[PDB]
Every structure is written in structure tokens, then in C-alpha cells.
Enzyme design. Structure first.
Site: not given
Lengths: 302, 302
Positions: B41, B143, B145
Site C-alpha cells: 500500500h 510512518g 507501517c
């Protein structure tokens, strides 16, 4: 979102940890530049710990009696020196993995990360608070002595703690990196009184702010209070007096949530007086006091 | 002595963390050998996350659309590939700090250490359990992720988790390092049901053993029980059924303390039925289920 008790990344400190052996005794040491720091009781047998004359015990030891190893790399010792309760072993090889570092004496209520080692080998990492009675609630086994506590300020590792003793109580005592004990404690195997273990009120409030930021707002009451009225309740429950400096430190958190400090104090008052009634806050059924305001903002902002 | 929720030392994992940028999106990636792993993503805007066709979105992207940086060191991308929910960015430079590593899919109930990052920069470390409903109770901000979960087996880093999503619930979802989500979750900004969050019974028992090892023996009852009788009580309190394999895994702890598993089960039964009556165990007013038997033995033995 989410809120966890979180240690600093330990990589910078891992490369500083060494094995210090003196006679039968082996424990963890901290290798920075051309100096290795360790608990001075490394020179002690179990029998010596009852009533050690460290000066006399140290005089039997010369440089060659200290085996310093850094993972299959036996360092050579070219000078020794006792500073308060720490030994300073000068060596020929400077640690190439020496980070930017400072030695700092921490205050009661402030937090730090512990890299728990055994005989110089890192085992794990957890967050601790230096409690008002200058103890910590850690996890240390034989070999952990010389494990260190630190904070990381962007590039600089600030060492604040070295583990020395476990009390008969079970709680833990240690020094700063200059060898001065936190609290009244001594490096002697004897009965040693830790005082009343009061709660860090400003931390509890920081945590309550973190809980509101994370959506737990049930505690929020319709009351308010003053400092005096609050502190009279605080003293009753062995909480630290809340000062104006404490209020000021919480201002950013107050500014973020739109909740005044005294309003939050009134919430805390009722929690203390009325309990939690079987409910929880941030997945805890107790009031938690090992998060500073800094910790909360660090984890909330970035 | 002492018992703390303890993460693995993070140094080995710190040197693998990088910043992955694609368009406006920036998050954390894992740099191992000549491959960087990240949430797929990363190619999504906020608008894309509502109903992403990842295949179509990825086709607009070429190698040069991915900016991979490792602390002021911009890597160059020479091949890209989507594997389930992870992007695999081949690069010219192999990570010189690549540890010995494995990719493992972890089981419900097992624990791991999370190195929480922001945009490739390590922020802190904490211990997590993969819960029966395949969620975790973490701490991740924008951030974070691409932050990873791992275990360290002596020399080998075993990566088990990469953080992708925060649910509307607040709890966290992610994949293994092959990009397969833990649980029924998808990388789409939509309403997603996490199931009933049951308790890891074998962990709770491990923790109760740890408490006895550490001197909290108040819970110990004068009763015993069977598995069936216990499991009928377990089901009532959304506890996992305790199996014979669970009993076997606790044997060493049983052997150390001299307390049979079923005897400890009876203790747990009463705690569940009668509550804690305002008392605490290892400084907690709740039954804790994020310590495996391995964790307990690791921290108790050495």
C-alpha cells in the site's frame, strides 16, 4: 494509535557490552573508548560480600587478574582504578563501536531503557522508572550485574544506570556510571531498607492524558480541584506531592487534549478514592506511573 | 529475580530498516540482501485505500518511482515484484548489515519483538503476542507501517510480522514476510471485523508459574481439577481450550516448581470465578497472557 511501554532501540548499547571476569566472579561490563566500566564487587567472592573492604580486596588484584572479553575477543588491561562503587579498567583496544555518549545521573520519576545482559551477552530490553525511593522493578539474574540503563537523545546515548544489587525485598539497586548509588544503598550483602515506595503523580497524569488521546475517556469527571486539596488526597495514598513545575510539564498534553491539569487531577482523585470499579485504562486495572510526559509525547507525536 | 515484559535486543534489526517512498507515500521497509520488503500500500494515496486495485495501481509504477533510502544513502532499484500484500524491491546494493535471518509465519499465542519505526527510523521496541483473533495490541503511528516483528534464535533473526493496517477498533493487523495477512484482514480502508478476542490460557498459566518462581504464591489453592471441568470454565470466560500439548509444554515449569499443571489450573479457575479481590500478581491487577512458557523459562534460567 495504541500505547505501549517501549524501550529505546538497543543496538548502540549492544556493541558496548563485555564480559568482565576476576577470579571466579564474572559479570557484565560497559566498554567505551579505552575504558571498561563494571561493578567493583567483581573482585568479591560470595564470602567477601558479607563485609567487604574493597580497598584491601582490590590491592590483591593487579591488571592481569581481570579477564575482559567482547565475544571471543580478549581485551588487554593496562591500568585499573576504583571510582566509588565502579571499577574502571583501562585497556589497549578502544571500542570501535563506541557511540556518541554521556554519563548522566537521573532524577526520581524519570525513565530509562535497561539492556539486560548475562556475562556480557545482551538478553533483552525493557523500560524502567527510577522510583522515588531510588529502586527499580527490573529483571536481573546472576550475570546481569553490570547491565546498564540508558536514554537515547537523537545521536547521543546517555548512560544513567548500572545494576549492582538485588535487595532481600527483590527490588533492584544500582549506581550511575560514576559509581554513586541511587539511594542509601551499599554494595554489601546485608539487610538494606528501601523506603516507602510512593507513586510518581506527574507520570500517572501523563498516562491519563495518553489514555484520553487513545480514546479511553471514561474516568473524566464533572469535578475539578486545587493543588492543596489534591495534595492532601495525594499524601493519603502515598502519591508524590504535585508541584507547579509538574503542572507546567503537562501543559503540552493539556494543550493537545483541551483538558486542564487540575481537571485531570480531580479525575485522579476519584480514581484513588473510589477505585476503578473493575474497569481498565489502556488495558490496565492499575494506575501506571512509569511513563513520563516526555515518553507520552514521544510515542504520540513521532 | 524480577519479571518483566522484555523484547529481544534490536541491534540486528535496526541495520535492516529503510525508508521507502513512492509518490507522496513514505513508510518503513526491511532491507535484507539485495531486496527491500515493504507494505504494498506504499503505492496508494489515501484515496486509493478505499477500493484499491493493487495490480492496476502497480502498473503505473516503474522502478524509478520508488525512492529507497537507508539514512542518507539512496539505494537504486533494478526490479520490482508484488508478493501477496508485500512489495519486493530489488536493489543494486546488498545490505552489508544483513544478519543471519529466516522468514517464519508465527502461530496464535506465540510472542515476538516489534521494532517500531517511523519512515525507516527505529523509534523503540516492545513485546507483542499474536492474539487468537490474529490481531496485536501495538503502538504504531503514521510512518510505522512496515515496522517488523521478530524473534532471535541465538544467531538467527526470525522475522514473523510486518505492520500494515490499523483497524477502526484501534488494534493492529499485518502480514508475515511473504505478504500473507495474519487473520481475515485485507489492505483496504474499510470496516473489518476482528473476532472475539479470547485469552491465551497456556500463557496465563506460564505467567502464574513465573509468579510462583518469583514468590507470589497467594493464588495457590487447596483444590485441583480435570481438563474437561477446567475447559468448561475456560469457555465461559472466553479462554482458549487447554489441550494435552499445552500441559506438556508446561512440564519443565511444573518440574521446577513442583506444582502439577491441573493444580495450577484450579488456581486459575478460582481467579476467573472469584476475581482477584483487589490483590495483584507480579504487579498486575489482571491475568496476563502475553508470556509464553518459552519466555518465562528464557527469563528465569538465562
Amino acid at each position: 494509535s495504541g500505547f505501549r511501554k517501549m524501550a529505546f532501540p538497543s543496538g548502540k548499547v549492544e556493541g558496548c557490552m563485555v564480559q568482565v571476569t576476576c577470579g571466579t566472579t564474572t559479570l557484565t561490563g560497559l566498554w567505551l573508548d579505552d575504558v571498561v566500566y563494571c561493578p567493583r564487587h567483581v573482585i568479591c567472592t560470595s564470602e567477601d560480600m558479607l563485609n567487604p573492604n574493597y580497598e584491601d580486596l582490590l590491592i590483591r588484584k593487579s591488571n592481569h587478574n581481570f579477564l575482559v572479553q567482547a565475544g571471543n575477543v580478549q581485551l588487554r588491561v593496562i591500568g585499573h582504578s576504583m571510582q566509588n562503587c565502579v571499577l574502571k579498567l583501562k585497556v589497549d583496544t578502544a571500542n570501535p563501536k563506541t557511540p556518541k555518549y554521556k554519563f548522566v545521573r537521573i532524577q526520581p520519576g524519570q525513565t530509562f531503557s535497561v539492556l539486560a545482559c548475562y556475562n556480557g551477552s545482551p538478553s533483552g530490553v525493557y523500560q524502567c522508572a527510577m522510583r522515588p525511593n531510588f529502586t527499580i522493578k527490573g529483571s536481573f539474574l546472576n550475570g546481569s550485574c553490570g547491565s546498564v540503563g540508558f536514554n537515547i537523545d537523537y545521536d547521543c546515548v546517555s548512560f544513567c544506570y548500572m545494576h549492582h544489587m538485588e535487595l532481600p525485598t527483590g527490588v533492584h539497586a544500582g549506581t550511575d556510571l560514576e559509581g554513586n548509588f541511587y539511594g542509601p544503598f551499599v554494595d554489601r550483602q546485608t539487610a538494606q531498607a528501601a523506603g516507602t515506595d510512593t507513586t510518581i503523580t506527574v507520570n500517572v497524569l501523563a498516562w491519563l492524558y495518553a489514555a484520553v488521546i487513545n480514546g479511553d475517556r471514561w474516568f473524566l469527571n464533572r469535578f475539578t480541584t486545587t493543588l492543596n486539596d489534591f495534595n492532601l488526597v495525594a499524601m493519603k495514598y502515598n502519591y508524590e506531592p504535585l508541584t507547579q513545575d509538574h503542572v507546567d510539564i503537562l501543559g503540552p498534553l493539556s494543550a493537545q487534549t483541551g483538558i486542564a491539569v487540575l481537571d485531570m487531577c480531580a479525575s485522579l482523585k476519584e480514581l484513588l478514592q473510589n477505585g476503578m470499579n473493575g474497569r481498565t485504562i489502556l488495558g490496565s486495572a492499575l494506575l501506571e506511573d512509569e511513563f513520563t510526559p516526555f515518553d507520552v509525547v514521544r510515542q504520540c507525536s513521532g
